[PDB]
Amino acid sequence: AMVGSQMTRQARRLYVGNIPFGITEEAMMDFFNAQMRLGGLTQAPGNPVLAVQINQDKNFAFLEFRSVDETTQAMAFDGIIFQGQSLKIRRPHDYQPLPGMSENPSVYVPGVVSTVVPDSAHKLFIGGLPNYLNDDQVKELLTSFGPLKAFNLVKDSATGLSKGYAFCEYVDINVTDQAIAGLNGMQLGDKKLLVQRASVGAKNA
């Protein structure tokens, strides 16, 4: 091509800084490829990095990814220390990344507990749930302290079954910490149910 593919060129490519002058394609490539695997960012198998571009006599480089969604998550490493190296990634405002959020259908009934739990500052995570119980059955355990405005149990589309974890939000803010106080550690059946505020950094900081 000639003067084409400009949008996706800079959209799949991020600005890498805080690099040592003389760093090689393979060096930076393998590092990021590994991190994606570690953080569970790699949505596709293999290497997320497609091509590494180092401008001559410049103290910076550019990393091109096969997918923009795999690109944007590399930007999360901006200011992070991986294995002693500090990575700096700048956000190119020549394009717009689309958030990887799947829109919820009307799978809830207005006037009752909603199956959509927003990521509030009172976001709650429940784990340890028996596979033979769904959100409705599990509500009985949570409702012991207070009712839920929203309770969504994440089931697996491949199993058709409850993975054993859900997210809730209590209608009142006082019952939030009062419920998690007693519910967390509930030894039901074979499992102790984990009940924890997800607003502390749910498997990611």
From Swiss-Prot:
Function comment: Plays a role in pre-mRNA splicing and 3'-end processing. By recruiting PRPF19 and the PRP19C/Prp19 complex/NTC/Nineteen complex to the RNA polymerase II C-terminal domain (CTD), and thereby pre-mRNA, may couple transcription to splicing. Induces cardiac troponin-T (TNNT2) pre-mRNA exon inclusion in muscle. Regulates the TNNT2 exon 5 inclusion through competition with MBNL1. Binds preferentially to a single-stranded structure within the polypyrimidine tract of TNNT2 intron 4 during spliceosome assembly.
Localization annotation: Nucleus
Chain positions found as Phosphoserine: S157
Modified residues (5-hydroxylysine): K139
Domain RRM: 12-94, 122-200
Lineage: Eukaryota, Metazoa, Chordata, Craniata, Vertebrata
Disease: Developmental delay, dysmorphic facies, and brain anomalies: An autosomal dominant disorder characterized by global developmental delay with intellectual disability and speech delay, epilepsy, hypotonia, short stature, microcephaly, intermittent exotropia, and non-specific facial dysmorphism. Brain imaging shows a thin corpus callosum and/or delayed myelination.
Protein name per Swiss-Prot or TrEMBL: Splicing factor U2AF 65 kDa subunit
Subunit comment: Interacts with U2AF1L4. Heterodimer with U2AF1. Binds unphosphorylated SF1. Interacts with SCAF11 and SNW1. Interacts with ZRSR2/U2AF1-RS2. Interacts with RBM17. Interacts with PRPF19; the interaction is direct. Interacts with POLR2A (via the C-terminal domain); recruits PRPF19 and the Prp19 complex to the pre-mRNA. Interacts with KHDC4 (Isoform 2). Interacts with ZRSR2. Interacts with the SF3B complex composed of SF3B1, SF3B2, SF3B3, SF3B4, SF3B5, SF3B6 and PHF5A.
Coiled coil: none
Annotated family: Belongs to the splicing factor SR family.
Bridged cysteine pairs (disulfide): none
